[PDB]
Amino acid sequence: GKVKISIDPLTRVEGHLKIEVEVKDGKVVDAKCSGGMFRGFEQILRGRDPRDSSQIVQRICGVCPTAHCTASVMAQDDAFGVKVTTNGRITRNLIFGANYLQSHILHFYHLAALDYVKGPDVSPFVPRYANADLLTDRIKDGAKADATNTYGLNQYLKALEIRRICHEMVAMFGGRMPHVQGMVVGGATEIPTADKVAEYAARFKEVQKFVIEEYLPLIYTLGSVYTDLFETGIGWKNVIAFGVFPEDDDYKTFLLKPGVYIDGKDEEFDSKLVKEYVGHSFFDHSAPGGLHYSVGETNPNPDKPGAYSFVKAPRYKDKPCEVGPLARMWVQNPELSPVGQKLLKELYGIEAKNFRDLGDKAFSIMGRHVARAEETWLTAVAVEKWLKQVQPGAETYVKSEIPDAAEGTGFTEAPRGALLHYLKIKDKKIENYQIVSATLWNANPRDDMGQRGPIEEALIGVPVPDIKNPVNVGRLVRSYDPXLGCAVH
Amino acid sequence: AKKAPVIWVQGQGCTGCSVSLLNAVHPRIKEILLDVISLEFHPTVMASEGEMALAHMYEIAEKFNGNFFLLVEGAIPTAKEGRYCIVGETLDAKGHHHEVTMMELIRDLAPKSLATVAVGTCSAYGGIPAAEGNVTGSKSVRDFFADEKIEKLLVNVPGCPPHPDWMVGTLVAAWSHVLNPTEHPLPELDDDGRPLLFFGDNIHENCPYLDKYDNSEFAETFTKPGCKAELGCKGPSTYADCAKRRWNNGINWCVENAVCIGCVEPDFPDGKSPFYVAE
């Protein structure tokens, strides 16, 4: 009595995603995640001036280009042998941090929320699933249902302006957005002025107010209606993080620290243990066993027998690991926002001080949204601090020369998860460039040993009581905030 | 107050053209969506998914045949029978599955459209996906139309990404033309099909650093004073109104911040590279 459901396009993610599930006895029993679009940035990059990479790679994704820019300029800093100044480091963090706020807000409202909030009766808010299990369906008190739905929809609409203001903040020192000009090998291209720091700060305070007063309360309220969604969309419960927003010039300390959590145990992150498999991916590898990114190969082959995705399959110590705010917040285990502490008590009867106090609830559909909202607040606290640390007038750029032969790796966390760019230079040109991105870790297919990717695995057990309105499939997928442009590049 | 019907499709794109559109002001995106256009299909933001989303797209393309704008973000890959870009899956009168390539989608929808508008340098000119080293046979809308022998009014709005003012302005001008063609002639296009309204000015000729350029005052590094020419600025070979309009609601622009990389031009990126070597 198995039924197959195929969803292509899985909309309200970035890029081209197909999801297939098998359903039996009202639950998902198997799943496949497929990325159907390829560009091959790693091929396009070969033979170029290595400095061009920090512009080229941004075009992997117009939602997270600052993450790719950051990873690229860090790879170049490493390869070129240049150290960024204090003010350069802080300026890079302000450019990138403003897009963390943009990206999380864009995701929750403009990608995720239409699985919960009933929009107006005009395109693109309709058509929608007939039985969509929305706030207006779940909340049985009609006035409360209307009021809660209107509350959520008004925030969706206001968030359109708030996310635009975040891009004003990115452009302040980044030049424009999408696709900044302001980050380069050696630092940042425009020294912050007192006036422009103040103009960034004024906009930031408006964003921060929305985060604390509107976004966090909505997420906790939403979770209190959908308590069942803290109990499904579980997956491997393995997470990895690389470290993001270095807080000192030697990159020893970060806002959110590197680390790995596998099978209930914390360990340090060791980049030597990252490798990619391609057994079910449209790529040829010169050797079996998975390849470390430093010898990565990008030889597309859409005819590869048994393959079903343009996404490669990264594993850490041969384990699937997921990435993103859940991963970073679990690894760092920061103190929860005051709003979260309060609303967990008031709305759920939960006493929680630190993220891990959520326990099992963290590894779920709603847990992923909570992690993302809490991280938005945590990032805002950091930006508020960086705005005091940044020094008007202080040099942000250090000169460098393209080396003949070198290698460098830039490590960071994109809003959606762990990100590195590996750069190898020969005869002053890009010899190899290998990108291991965030959604790559989440939306990958099975590896050579048949181990499902994290989204595939997290789909197992998801309830589908109505096969014609399989709303929880998309809810699980969107909780990961997938970017398929990033996943495939 | 009849809104312009829009079907927005993505090929080999990065969603940056969409994100830039979300940054519109005067009007802002809320007013664009509720008052200016009917955004009927858009994979990044629409409520429906899969079968329902595609069925709706095709129903609109039928009901509004010859009366919707086909907006294209991203390039069209033609290698390997189009299989480098699968945009969806369709189901027959029987129960079977058929993948739809970007080639198939554009071949289908373009003849149904009132006009096609290629937003961004990828769709207009090939851009980064079509740059040296790619193996996907990545192609622009104009080249795909030429290969397919499709004659459909086509307007290009390039940039990587384009400014929201360029996209909104062009779409509004096109819709005004359709509603009253003699009161609102179509914007004059250059040889590369982009409106002179936005792409007629040369950046360099209109640049506030031109006095410095003329006096040979060149910035030694990004954070020194002077014209940006020695840092790689492609303003001299680039045609857009960025010097006037600036970016992100007037907050900054590429030349003030750093350099112009010529992102609106049909030879972007290869003809504008290396980015940090002077023209």
Ligand code: SF4
């Ligand atoms: S034109 Fe640039 S911003 Fe637009 S889809 Fe192409 S790469 Fe992205």
Ligand code: SF4
């Ligand atoms: S900064 Fe660029 S566009 Fe401006 S005058 Fe110099 S070379 Fe020309």
Ligand code: SF4
């Ligand atoms: S200044 Fe140059 S790189 Fe920047 S948006 Fe305008 S044309 Fe593109």
Ligand code: FCO
């Ligand atoms: N955030 C983001 Fe993009 C993805 N996935 C990257 O890296």
Ligand SMILES: [Ca+2]
């Ligand atoms: Ca195939």
Ligand SMILES: [Ca+2]
């Ligand atoms: Ca890769």
Ligand SMILES: [Ca+2]
């Ligand atoms: Ca033909």
Ligand SMILES: [Cl-]
């Ligand atoms: Cl703007």
Ligand code: NI
């Ligand atoms: Ni992305």
Ligand SMILES: [S]
């Ligand atoms: S980002």
